[PDB]
């Protein structure tokens with residue numbers, strides 16, 4: 044009848060949070076340097092583990108999802124990273140005299 | 145049912161009372177768990193005790209359980225007016241459904257007396273047209289819960305068309321009952337008065353109606 | 358902290374079948390057994406069986422093993438920890454001694470030595486088994502410290518039950534409804550009375566609303 | 581007056597393309613520290 | 626019987642308390658200036674930072690080595706009034722953490738002070754002779 | 755009675771030894787290439803690096819779980835000649851650390867060798883039967 048608090052380390056408890064995710068893609072080999080795969084994305088594990096959570100019911104909201112906002116800024120930032128070293132056509136703004144084909 | 149309870153038990157106000165629950169060894173005690181339920185007639189029951197001592201959530205500490213090898217017991221301490229009702233025990237295991245007991249009616253002694261309320265209604269003009277006639281005698285807020293009703297036609301007993309209900313418990317832990325007297329319109333109009341007499345061991349009350357007024 | 362609401366009372370002839378429903382809310386329907394218990398005057402309270410909404414395992418008492426069919430629907434989620442559901446019991450080969458009150462009940466714990474133990478009960482469903490036909494009631498007015506009493510008389514109806522309200526449920530204080538009488542003919546009759554101040558004749562109109570769903574009849578009588 | 585409904589395509593935002601594949605996913609953090617009451621007590625020794 | 630990481634998240638607290646090892650394992654395990662490299666390195670530092678914080682709390686509660694540890698703090702009923710069967714056989718750790726998330730900070734403070742800060746001084750005065 | 759982080763820095767060693775939990779808690783807890791981001795991330799890695807080093811020493815001294823641990827190393831008088839009352843009721847941890855900072859490295863070496871490297875082999879030979 045005398046109750047006491049006891050600490051448990053490893054209880055299946057989670058809370059909604061937004062963190063910094065990273066990239067992971069299979070080991071595709073090759074021409075290359077495709078903007079998204081980049082020089083190095085963590086290669087996907089040879090076998091992924093999908094663990095079904097029985098009895099669990101979670102609330103979802105694809106419209107307030109922060110994964111979308113992160114992916115958006117990742118595509119944009121990846122684009123600029125690939126344009127920086129390429130040739131800039133500042134002198135190509137010379138006056139053009141064009142005729143039909 | 146093979147699970148027998150005490151048919152009746154009584155305890156005084158502010159006191160305690162114990163209900164028993166026993167039966168054959170096939171359906172009793174060891175190798176079995178016992179639960180207790182409060183079950184007022186005409187209403188949904190309430191679980192008070194499960195797995196022996198351990199009482200259901202929110203149950204007052206006034207309730208306690210105890211199980212011997214041959215029988216189980218339920219103890220109600222600090223008796224209240226609301227504790228006066230019917231109680232059932234159950235024998236069960238984890239994989240086997242309930243076996244209900246024979247039932248126990250608990251009476252709480254040492255309670256204050258309640259004066260009977262008697263009301264008699266005559267037949268409606270729409271009812272005399274039908275043409276029938278039924279007198280309705282309603283009784284409420286009396287204690288203890290037992291009445292006897294007698295009808296009279298011009299101060300003389302009636303025996304044809306008398307119907308009386310059993311006593312029933314009110315929400316305020318008093319009791320109520322009703323009685324109906326069916327008559328033909330001739331008997332109703334051919335008498336000077338009709339009477340409903342409600343008799344209690346401490347006091348008899350009489351209510352009278354008359355076709356004249 | 359959830360409520361179980363069962364289907365309304367029904368009158369059926371002996372030999373027929375009837376299906377009672379039990380809709381749940383306020384808790385995870387999948388996590389608790391649904392028990393079915395009945396109470397008759399001849400046998401008292403009698404446990405019939407339970408069924409698990411999660412696994413579908415059912416356990417029926419031998420007395421109802423051959424006449425009771427228990428089924429459940431899939432839970433409709435509301436929040437992460439609550440949902441709504443529905444359980445059904447179909448009883449066939451009805452007899453006169455099967456007339457009584459039937460209850461569905463939610464189990465006690467998800468795990469332990471008494472998981473299925475009926476803990477949360479519904480309001481009950483009244484089942485009448487009889488060869489007699491349904492009969493609607495006849496409602497009559499009950500003519501009326503400075504206090505008085507008035508009401509409405511419900512005479513000769515079948516079967517049970519009959520519900521009475523006042524002013525479409527606006528009047529609940531001072532209402533006193535009496536149990537029904539069992540006439541020698543086999544028909545029931547009850548009365549309902551309300552206590553009001555005698556001075557309130559110029560400001561209050563009392564309407565008694567009688568509903569007898571077995572006959573699908575409503576009566577609104579002005580006292 | 582709700583008599584007829586018209587539907588036109590559009591491309592207001594580029595994020596809607598990502599939501600078409602991230603509708604099923606969600607990020608949560610694991611909090612593995614739980615405190616509960618039991619009939620256990622530490623030994624004073 | 627293993628279901629996997631967070632498999633018992635919908636089970637009763639008693640059932641989930643049996644597979645705490647499962648959550649314990651998967652709880653920690655020319656220019657590299659790519660957007661992925663900065664994200665990865667910052668993600669790795671975030672993972673070890675959260676792990677060391679929980680292990681820090683277990684340290685100051687004298688429960689470093691164990692997944693289940695008992696304390697001296699009595700269970701104040703204002704936190705939860707539920708009995709043992711109702712807690713461990715009727716609730717999940719999720720809805721439990723929601724019911725007690727309110728008093729968690731107070732409980733953590735009593736957990737570090739009441740025992741291990743008192744226990745260590747009394748341990749020195751006891752083994753003093 | 756709590757004064758806060760480092761509150762007992764000017765108190766006697768005995769008084770400060772009572773609130774070691776206070777120092778233990780607050781001891782660990784398009785382009786992100788900003789000067790602040792590089793400083794922050796490098797600062798966070800520095801904090802966990804110092805914490806893990808002290809916890810490493812407690813580990814190799816067999817004192818991982820505790821804030822107060824007793825050892826087998828006897829106190830060589832050449833380090834300090836002061837009696838217990840003079841040390842614990844007349845000195846602060848600051849001026850103590852200054853008086854013994856000279857022999858700290860030697861003491862740390864004896865602390866990892868003398869007991870826990872001897873204790874573990876003798877523990878196996880004792881529980882060997």
Ligand SMILES: *[C@@H]1O[C@H](CO)[C@@H](O[C@@H]2O[C@H](CO)[C@@H](O[C@@H]3O[C@H](CO[C@H]4O[C@H](CO[C@H]5O[C@H](CO)[C@@H](O)[C@H](O)[C@@H]5O)[C@@H](O)[C@H](O[C@H]5O[C@H](CO)[C@@H](O)[C@H](O)[C@@H]5O)[C@@H]4O)[C@@H](O)[C@H](O[C@H]4O[C@H](CO)[C@@H](O)[C@H](O)[C@@H]4O)[C@@H]3O)[C@H](O)[C@H]2NC(C)=O)[C@H](O)[C@H]1NC(C)=O
Nearest residue numbers: 097098238239387388389390409411414467469470635636
């Ligand atoms: C997700 O949530 C759900 C719901 O919350 C949860 O499901 C509950 O899980 C708990 C624990 O696992 C269950 O509680 C246990 O139930 C055990 C099963 O009950 C037995 O009895 C049934 C009736 O048997 C009679 O009838 C048959 C004819 O049908 C007859 O032949 C028999 O002889 C007997 O007379 C039976 O149908 C049932 O069978 C199922 O289970 C077995 C596995 O055991 C399976 O192989 C079958 O195919 C079938 O699916 C079963 O045999 C019960 O044994 C158990 O009691 C023992 O264990 C407890 C410890 O838990 C001991 O304390 C106790 O003393 C006993 O030794 C306990 O009662 C509960 O019933 C489930 N359903 C609910 C709560 O609705 C999931 O587990 C959750 N999962 C996750 C991952 O979170």
Ligand SMILES: *[C@@H]1O[C@H](CO)[C@@H](O[C@@H]2O[C@H](CO)[C@@H](O[C@@H]3O[C@H](CO)[C@@H](O)[C@H](O)[C@@H]3O)[C@H](O)[C@H]2NC(C)=O)[C@H](O)[C@H]1NC(C)=O
Nearest residue numbers: 129130131132133134135136137138139140141142143144
């Ligand atoms: C776009 O305009 C340019 C002019 O600036 C066109 O280039 C010229 O196209 C003509 C064809 O009409 C070429 O004529 C050929 O020249 C070669 C020279 O080796 C000769 O061998 C052939 O017999 C013929 O005369 C001309 O050479 C060429 N001029 C240059 C500088 O390349 C071009 O064709 C136009 N393209 C389109 C799609 O309009």
Ligand SMILES: *[C@@H]1O[C@H](CO)[C@@H](O)[C@H](O)[C@H]1NC(C)=O
Nearest residue numbers: 704722723724725726727728
């Ligand atoms: C949690 O705590 C807040 C603030 O005291 C209170 O308003 C809320 O009702 C609580 N909810 C819980 C613990 O269920």
Ligand SMILES: *[C@@H]1O[C@H](CO)[C@@H](O)[C@H](O)[C@H]1NC(C)=O
Nearest residue numbers: 833851852853854855856857
């Ligand atoms: C510390 O050690 C150095 C080198 O042995 C010595 O010169 C100095 O006097 C000492 N100071 C102390 C410990 O007070």
